[PDB]
């Protein structure tokens, strides 16, 4: 008479079904990854099983798998939460937000879905939402596809082929990065928590570890850290900074993508993050320039693309070339036991403040018993390097080291974007 939990144990497997979308489950360079990805992961390494993912075709399938014998143990799918499905604790408040196309008439509140072409998934809560909707405004239409994801109405807002989707908050903020397009209209109710979902009946057994583990994860800064990868892009780089990274992906990347991967690939490095370089550097402008005799789409010095073979540092193939060799070998000459990926990060704070800033910096985290092979303690010293108090303790004195922060942080956060939508 095995409980929920003692089968998962004894198969020493736990079976999550999950949504192919970006907010939930996909593959990157690392195998899989995403936020539910990630979370239920950490829940079955708790338990000490191993974690296998199956993904359904659409909300109806999923929930039907679930209320299958011999079928998932819980789903992890961004749910908003029947005998036959329950519901873990919730992990995350995100809203219901009706997205139209930029330069189209904003829809202000529900009465103005009347009249516009709408789309969401079948079987979802957005679907259910406006069945309530309807009920008040007989008029109102909107059709549902089972063939399709939340990405995929987003793009077709995008590219025009509907006037409106319905969509959580933290999905658009994603993909708000991908589609120059789309904008939030309102927000079509308030924020609601979403859950796991677990297969009806009266055994709580992995009902209570479920919750246990989201308990501990709430606690710890588990979701939130997960939550500020994946669904942070809006809070960090601004609505306006988010939706123009889009545009500039769409209209400029194209442009120099290939001089980036046949770098990535002369030095044996990710191209994405050389992309992201730029991108923080440039905004993969070819012909900006500084103040300080810095030029071009990596921002290098003279001296730099001299060293470098770089001729003219207006051309973008040249600048990228010196740019992405210079941060190779920047990362090639810290201290050789820093591990990636701080190694990576190190070299990036390098790359925007140079070596003797950054030496101070490390020195100043020894001074402060942190470690200064530590990313996160020598991020903590750098802002110091702009403060009077700490750079008059310092040999090289004072940098700009909170700018270096928001550089580092951001081309993380931009390498991300690019990465799971392209190929290495
Ligand atoms: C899955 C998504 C579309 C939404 N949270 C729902 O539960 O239906």
Same mark, same amino acid.
């Given at each position: 008479?095995?409980?929920? *939990? #003692?089968?998962?144990?004894? #198969? ?37 099983? #191993? ?61 103005? *879905? ?17 069945? #309530? ?64 979902? /677990? ?25 939130? @850290? ?10 960090? /780089? ?109 070299? *990036? ?12 910096? @490390? ?62």
């Amino acid at each position: 008479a095995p409980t929920a *939990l #003692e089968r998962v144990q004894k #198969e020493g497997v736990l079976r999550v079904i999950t949504r192919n979308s970006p907010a939930t489950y996909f593959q990157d360079r690392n195998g899989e990854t995403g936020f539910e990805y990630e979370l239920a992961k950490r829940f079955a390494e708790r338990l000490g099983v #191993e974690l296998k993912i199956e993904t359904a075709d659409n909300l109806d399938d999923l929930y039907a798998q679930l209320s299958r014998e011999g079928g998932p143990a819980l789903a992890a799918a961004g749910l908003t939460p029947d005998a036959s499905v329950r519901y873990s604790h919730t992990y995350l408040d995100v809203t219901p937000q009706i997205i139209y196309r930029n330069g189209q008439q904003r829809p202000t509140r529900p009465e103005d *879905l009347v009249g516009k072409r709408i789309m969401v998934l079948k079987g979802s809560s957005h679907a259910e939402q406006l069945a #309530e909707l309807k009920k008040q405004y007989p008029e109102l239409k909107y059709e549902e596809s089972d063939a399709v994801e939340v990405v995929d109405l987003l793009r077709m807002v995008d590219v025009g082929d509907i006037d409106l989707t319905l969509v959580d908050s933290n999905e658009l903020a994603m993909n708000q990065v991908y589609f120059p397009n789309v904008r939030v209209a309102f927000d079509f109710g308030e924020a609601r928590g979403l859950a796991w979902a /677990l297969p009806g009946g009266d055994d709580d057994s992995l009902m209570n570890e479920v919750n246990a583990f989201l308990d501990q994860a709430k606690k710890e800064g588990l979701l939130q @850290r997960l939550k500020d990868r994946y669904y942070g892009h809006v809070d960090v /780089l601004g609505y306006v900074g988010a939706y123009t990274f889009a545009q500039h992906l769409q209209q400029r990347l194209p442009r120099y993508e290939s001089h980036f991967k046949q770098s990535g690939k002369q030095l044996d490095t990710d191209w994405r993050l050389l992309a992201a370089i730029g991108y923080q550097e440039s905004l993969w402008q070819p012909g900006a320039t500084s103040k300080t005799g810095v030029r071009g789409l990596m921002m290098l010095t003279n001296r730099t693309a001299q060293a470098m073979g770089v001729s003219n540092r207006l051309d973008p193939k040249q600048s990228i070339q010196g740019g992405s060799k210079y941060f190779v070998q920047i990362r090639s000459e810290l201290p050789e036991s820093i591990k990636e990926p701080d190694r990576s990060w190190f070299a *990036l704070a390098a790359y925007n403040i140079g070596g003797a800033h950054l030496e101070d910096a @490390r020195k100043m985290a020894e001074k402060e018993g942190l470690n200064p092979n530590k990313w996160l303690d020598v991020k903590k010293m750098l802002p110091r390097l702009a403060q009077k108090q700490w750079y008059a303790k310092t040999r090289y004195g004072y940098a700009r080291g909170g700018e270096t922060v928001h550089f580092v942080q951001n081309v993380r956060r931009y390498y991300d974007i690019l990465t799971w939508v392209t190929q290495p």
